[PDB]
A = this chain, B = another copy of it.
Amino acid sequence: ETTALVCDNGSGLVKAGFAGDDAPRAVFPSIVGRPRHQGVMVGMGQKDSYVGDEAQSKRGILTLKYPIEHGIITNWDDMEKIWHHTFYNELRVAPEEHPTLLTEAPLNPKANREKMTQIMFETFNVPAMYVAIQAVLSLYASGRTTGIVLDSGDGVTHNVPIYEGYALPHAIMRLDLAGRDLTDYLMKILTERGYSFVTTAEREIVRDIKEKLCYVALDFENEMATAASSSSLEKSYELPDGQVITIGNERFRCPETLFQPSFIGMESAGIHETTYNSIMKCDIDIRKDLYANNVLSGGTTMYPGIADRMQKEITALAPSTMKIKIIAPPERKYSVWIGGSILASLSTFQQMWISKQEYDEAGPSIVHRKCF
């Protein structure tokens, strides 16, 4: 059978590999570096485009750009570079031999779904392809046809009620606030403590810090009080040039913005609130199988202690005769990619692919007839 490349379009990490395997085989940063100055390398070759880990090692001399900003492809040129690198550098295979599965947000722009369909088929010459909602794949990785997924990426958070494998198009909710924003916010609040960070390279350390040291508090006022009353809510981090910095209440404050969007000046409601409001758009006999399967997904959900917080919050908004229970997969950061690996290796799914012939007949439009 044809080996399908599953490529998760994560906004701060690419996750890529082959279908039928239990885990991604390449996990690298979504970063394209291009030179700030030319002349840097003399006696050695210069290139102008570095991608992923190659770019990461050269960060000092590169201008980093993100291909995907807030789950939205913002530059077609940087999306292409990521792709060129995925196939030829990272997996070292011809894409033209391998069908492609691409991941997307709910309500991912149609003009974008098309430019993605077109770019894959004309330049890479893919034999077949498909595009699928991130949360639907994470639900298949959770072994379920039906449930509501809180998917919080490295850039967007969605609440996605799904039923018999279809995401409910009137009931889904979105929040632009997650891992990308979270770094920029963390950096702000550290400047406020007097650990000013103004350089973007230092920003990436702040990113790493965030992933390692942030934790979801179970009670925001009680932990805040604890940090005000004692310095036991602080963890040290040694910067790689030396210099020991102390990260305080910023640890739980940073992700606190997910529950209270007003802290960054939004009119948006919180991730627990949009969970509750999303299920309340659904019919009562499916509210049962939706509430019974509240699933966490994506990189932002890997902060410890999140389940007890989300269990709390949802039981407080929701009536005490729906079964409330948080499902947190063992490696929830990958559950989109794992769900794509499952879906692309089902014998029933092989009828669904966009073929090169259907693209030649209808142009990039074909995704809006084959994908749902």
Q: Which A residues are within 8 Å of any B CB, using their own CB?
A: 36-37, 39-44, 57, 59-61, 63, 72, 107, 109-112, 140, 145, 163-166, 168-171, 174, 176, 188, 191-194, 196, 198-202, 205, 238-243, 262, 264-265, 267-268, 281-288, 291, 318-322, 346, 348, 372
Count of identical protomers in the assembly: 3
- What are 11 sample pairs from A and B whose C-beta atoms fall under 8 A apart? A36-B265, A42-B164, A43-B145, A59-B286, A61-B163, A199-B283, A201-B285, A241-B287, A241-B288, A242-B319, A267-B283
Question: Is there contact, CB below 8 Å, between B267 and A36?
Answer: yes
Asked, given contacts A110-B193, A267-B200, whether A348 binds B171 with beta carbons under 8 Å apart, the answer is no
Contact of A171 among B265, B268, B320 (CB under 8 A): B265
Question: Is there contact, CB below 8 Å, between B201 and A41?
Answer: no
Q: A320 to chain B: which residues have CB within 8 Å? A: 242
Question: Is there contact, CB below 8 Å, between B284 and A240?
Answer: yes
Q: A191 to chain B: which residues have CB within 8 Å? A: 107, 109
Asked, given contacts A165-B43, A284-B199, A348-B43, whether A111 binds B267 with beta carbons under 8 Å apart, the answer is no
Q: A267 to chain B: which residues have CB within 8 Å? A: 36, 63, 199-201, 283
Q: A61 to chain B: which residues have CB within 8 Å? A: 163-164
